[PDB]
Design a protein around this ligand. Sequence first.
Ligand SMILES: CN1CC[C@@H](Oc2cccc(F)c2)C1=O
Ligand SMILES: CN1CC[C@@H](Oc2cccc(F)c2)C1=O
Ligand SMILES: [Zn+2]
Length: 140
Amino acid sequence: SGAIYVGNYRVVNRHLATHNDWANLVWEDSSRDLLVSSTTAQGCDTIARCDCQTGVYYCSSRRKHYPVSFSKPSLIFVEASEYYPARYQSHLMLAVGHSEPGDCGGILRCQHGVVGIVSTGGNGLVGFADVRDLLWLDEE
Ligand SMILES: CN1CC[C@@H](Oc2cccc(F)c2)C1=O
Ligand SMILES: CN1CC[C@@H](Oc2cccc(F)c2)C1=O
Ligand SMILES: [Zn+2]
């Protein structure tokens, strides 16, 4: 689990989004596993505006933050699934690291702020859904 809170926005994994997330839908992308919902309480997170390829992510399944090198956001085919069709995901960044399904929503951050959230895992890779291209997350 886990979310980003910037301004009056909540960013979550689309597969983990609640009834309340969908009641207050701002934006979703099924190909990116991202959903943004509206919040009443102002969030204090800063979104990274950069092309860092290094940072730290939280891994709930190890209760540990790991420093990682990661790929630039790309279209990638993700093997295995759940209740979803083991398929393509856009704006996805891979690193070598530990990721289980419940690690989704773990934040990846550089010195500039929030880069993305854990979205995929397996084979000793962790996938992160990039949010840095969503410039509208920092205004009204
Ligand atoms: C996982 N999902 C998908 C829809 C969402 O709940 C809803 C359903 C209808 C109206 C609404 F405002 C929200 C939910 O729980
Ligand atoms: C659509 N979904 C839901 C979670 C993801 O599966 C995983 C599998 C392993 C690690 C991980 F972090 C995520 C997926 O394919
Ligand atoms: Zn950065």
